[PDB]
Amino acid sequence: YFQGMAKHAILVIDMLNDFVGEKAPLRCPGGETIIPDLQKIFEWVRGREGDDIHLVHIQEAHRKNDADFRVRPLHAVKGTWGSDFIPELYPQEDEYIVQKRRHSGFAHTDLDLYLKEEGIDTVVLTGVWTNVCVRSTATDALANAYKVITLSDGTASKTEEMHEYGLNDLSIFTKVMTVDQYIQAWEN
């Protein structure tokens, strides 16, 4: 996990205008709570010498569909504000961005390809919701022969109950650790 020529990708899953924040139209209540921890990890990674760690930003970007009775769908639509990353956790110029239309960051995307190209062996999961899109991305990373780390305080769900049971499922096949621990692990 940490030694050797280990190369890691931190995936940030759906920290978007639609979902995150008190005023969010599609608000996931858990998300606001993880922002400072995420900011902290962003700063640390950006600070770091070299690139043994990559930040990858994943956004739900559903296709615009005019053939719908409601004024807006209950998901983030591509090209909109809601789809866009929150200013607090906005991507920086060199950072890869992935758009997805299904739960997993992998599904029908170029994430696996990015990961292969960059020689990445471990994915580390952050974002919302821990029990849905986060877990799905993890399952998929595992299925694609990546190692997986879930950051327990880097993830959140609609409810604290969901988050905890999500962590439980994640613990079965991923390594679960806090943000501080992950950082300390690299300090070695």
Residues near ligand NH4, by CB under 6 A = 62-63, 101
Pair of tokens at residue 52: 């043994």
Binders of Na ion in range 121-180 (CB under 5 A): 136, 139
What residue ranges bind a second copy (CB under 8 A)?
A: 63, 66, 94, 96, 101-104, 107-110, 112-113, 116-117, 131-132, 135-136, 139-140, 142-145, 162, 165, 168-169, 172-173
Smallest distance, a second copy to C-beta of residue 161, A: 9
Residue whose CB is less far from Na ion, 142 or 183:
142
14, 144, 166 from 38: Cα distances, Å: 12, 25, 19
- Among left, alpha and beta (phi > 0; psi -120 to 50; other), residue 108 is left
Q: What angle do CA 7, 97, 121 make, to 5 degrees?
A: 20
Q: What's the one-letter identity of residue 82?
A: G
Residue 182 near which of a second copy, Na ion, ligand NH4, none (CB within 5-8 Å, type-dependent): none
